[PDB]
Design a protein around this ligand. Structure first.
Ligand SMILES: [Mg+2]
Ligand SMILES: [Zn+2]
Length: 324
């Protein structure tokens, strides 16, 4: 059921060399992978090597894994291969700035979880799947697509010559799969609200403790949200172009809902584009800003993400004032 890369594809990646000029840019939070499409797989290899080490994974298996992952993302407007690499780069930047707070196993697991976190996304939301009783909603009662993404991740690792984690001890192997499962499930925004509220309380009361596994799981979960939403932390033109893709996907879902006799929420209605700026303001105030605010309190080095998010909030406010 999984697509598999070709030999030409993974061998090509093995020989790829990242232009020297980008080495410096990739370390920055605001880096936009957009203008370097042919280099995306190579950029991921580079980040894994820098964060985890050039020998952390057998190169041949890592290249097969990456190119097969790319082949299992669909040609949808937003939850595609570009989104996966963008989210993984944000994780790389967060890890580089907070390196020793995380174990080697966590860094490998998180970069991989980010690349695979939307695997086989079809362009439809959990709301849609559950509303119309898709088979996936029966199999996965909550966090439907996310449980599916994790299942797809395991399926790729099971492809011949694709298991980049086999060299881990049996104990660490189970530990990394759990890190990945929890990280992918955390990308279900439905869970973010409670996770952020809990973390803020733990932080403020001083009970937050990183040697407490349940606390670590929650911090990692907020990092996942922060990376998944990072388009709001790029330079405005980038943030604006990405929003176009996000809505293109939403509108296609809304179109299907109308065919089934259900009026879509305004956000998914292509006939209600005038409501988008206010909708963005609402998302930033209720989701994005609080997310990066709490992440910055827990991990000070991530402050640049919050500053960028605040700048974009101001940009959406300018749009509402008619200053676009
Ligand atoms: Mg997702
Ligand atoms: Zn995502």
């Amino acid at each position: 059921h999984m697509s598999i890369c070709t030999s030409e594809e993974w061998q090509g990646l093995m020989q790829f060399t990242l232009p020297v000029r980008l080495c410096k840019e990739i370390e920055l939070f605001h880096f936009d992978i957009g203008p370097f499409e042919n280099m995306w797989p190579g950029i991921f290899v580079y980040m894994v090597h820098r964060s985890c080490g050039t020998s952390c994974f057998e190169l041949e298996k890592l290249c097969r894994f990456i190119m097969s992952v790319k082949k299992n993302y669909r040609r949808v407007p937003y939850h595609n291969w570009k989104h996966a690499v963008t989210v993984a780069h944000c994780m790389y930047a967060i890890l580089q700035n907070n390196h020793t707070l995380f174990t080697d196993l966590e860094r490998k697991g998180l970069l991989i979880a980010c690349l695979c976190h939307d695997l086989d996304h079809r362009g439809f939301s959990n709301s849609y799947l559950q509303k119309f009783d898709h088979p996936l909603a029966a199999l996965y009662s909550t966090s439907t697509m996310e449980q599916h993404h994790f299942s797809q991740t395991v399926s790729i690792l099971q492809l011949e010559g694709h298991n980049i984690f086999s060299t881990l001890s049996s104990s660490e192997y189970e530990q990394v799969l759990e890190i990945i499962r929890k990280a992918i499930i955390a990308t279900d925004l439905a869970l973010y609200f409670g996770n952020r509220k809990q973390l803020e309380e733990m932080y403020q009361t001083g009970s937050l403790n990183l040697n407490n596994q349940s606390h670590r799981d929650r911090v990692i979960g907020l990092m996942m949200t922060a990376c998944d939403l990072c388009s709001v932390t790029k330079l405005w033109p980038v943030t604006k172009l990405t929003a176009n893709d996000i809505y293109a996907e939403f509108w296609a879902e809304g179109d299907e809902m109308k065919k089934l006799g259900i009026q879509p929420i305004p956000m998914m209605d292509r006939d209600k584009k005038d409501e988008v700026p206010q909708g963005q303001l609402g998302f930033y105030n209720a989701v994005a800003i609080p997310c990066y605010t709490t992440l910055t309190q827990i991990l000070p080095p991530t402050e640049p993400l919050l500053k960028a998010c605040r700048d974009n909030l101001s940009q959406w406010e300018k749009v509402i004032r008619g200053e676009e």
